[PDB]
A paper describes a structure:
Synthesis of EGT by Mycobacterium tuberculosis (M. tb) is critical for maintaining bioenergetic homeostasis and protecting the bacterium from alkylating agents, oxidative stress, and anti-tubercular drugs. Multiple X-ray crystal structures of Mycolicibacterium smegmatis EgtD show that EgtD possesses a Histidine binding domain and a Rossmann-fold domain, which affords ordered substrate binding of L-Histidine and AdoMet, respectively. In this work, library screening and structure-guided strategies identified multiple classes of M. tb EgtD inhibitors that bind in various regions of the enzyme active site.
The obtained crystals were subjected to X-ray diffraction experiments and X-ray crystal structures were obtained for M. tb EgtD with HD2, HD3, and HD6. The chemical structure of HD6 is very similar to that of HD2, so the interactions between EgtD and HD6 are nearly identical to those with HD2. The only difference observed is a rotamer change in the side chain of Glu282 resulting in slight reorientation of the carboxylate moiety. However, the presence of a hydrogen atom on the α-amino moiety of HD6 now affords a bidentate interaction between Asn166 and HD6, which is more similar to the interaction between EgtD and the L-Histidine substrate. First, HD2, HD3, and HD6 most closely resemble a Histidine amino acid as they all possess α-amino and α-carboxyl moieties, but the α-amino group is elaborated with a variety of chemical linkages.
Numbering used by the authors: 1 to 321
Amino acid sequence: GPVSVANHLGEDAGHLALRRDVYSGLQKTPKSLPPKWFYDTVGSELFDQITRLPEYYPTRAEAEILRARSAEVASACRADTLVELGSGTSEKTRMLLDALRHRGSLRRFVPFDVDASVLSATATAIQREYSGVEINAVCGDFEEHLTEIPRGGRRLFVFLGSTIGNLTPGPRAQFLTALAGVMRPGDSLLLGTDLVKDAARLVRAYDDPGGVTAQFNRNVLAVINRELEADFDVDAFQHVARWNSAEERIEMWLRADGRQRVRVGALDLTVDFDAGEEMLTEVSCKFRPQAVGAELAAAGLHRIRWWTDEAGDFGLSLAAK
Ligand SMILES: O=C(N[C@@H](Cc1c[nH]cn1)C(=O)O)C1CC=CC1
């Protein structure tokens, strides 16, 4: 079937976004950086490695649920269109496409993400693997472009991996409200959320002993050095994963080993790190089952299915507009 890729991001959008995120985040107290910048080519291969670590249970936990429940997802939502908020590159994408195809209802695949080159490769791959399916890839961001997702048919929106945990409660409610606003009655959302559990298991999932996650975290400094002509001493920053018991969220920090003075040339900006000062690079909010249903309802959606894996480590919600 035919492929389309519609690009709503200017060629310079990513660079300007990085400039302003860094300019603002390095002047906060504490300093912080959005986690979107982990995912350059190096960071993405490091993330792929993380998903295979025994300590990082979310990937396999969600896959276990999806292998058991994708058929029920397909029959409950009756969708003819799969909208992925993501790049379409995973085995989980195929699990869901296969389930819709097995019902004979798969007409359209809409991968929605910020990298047109990844989206292009996905569209080609899906076109080869799924005859009779139209692929309408959309290059855009959550803030501006959810309305650019093609209309019509009965759409299952998918946002897996507990990526929604990267949004603190305020922005998370704003995002779910915006998403539900582009959803039509009869459309569905399948949402993955990692669950509150033993704090040590949570910290261990974000600090594997071989230091893959540590490398992934520090890599945001390499990205800033390379893209904005900065001089972070990348090795003088230590990876710290913290469980925030009050907000029930994992936090990833980078901790300065000794005082540091960093000049970001492309921004004409100098910042200081005190010895032992920590900079926040990612929050990973963890959820309770009832609370996810309540957040969906607050956005105008109605949860009709909740599933966990056999250990209760991870949850999937199916919600209808
Ligand atoms: O992948 C995401 N979140 C993961 C990231 C991760 C895994 N190990 C360490 N960090 C999580 O919180 O588990 C989302 C946010 C942006 C792109 C997808």
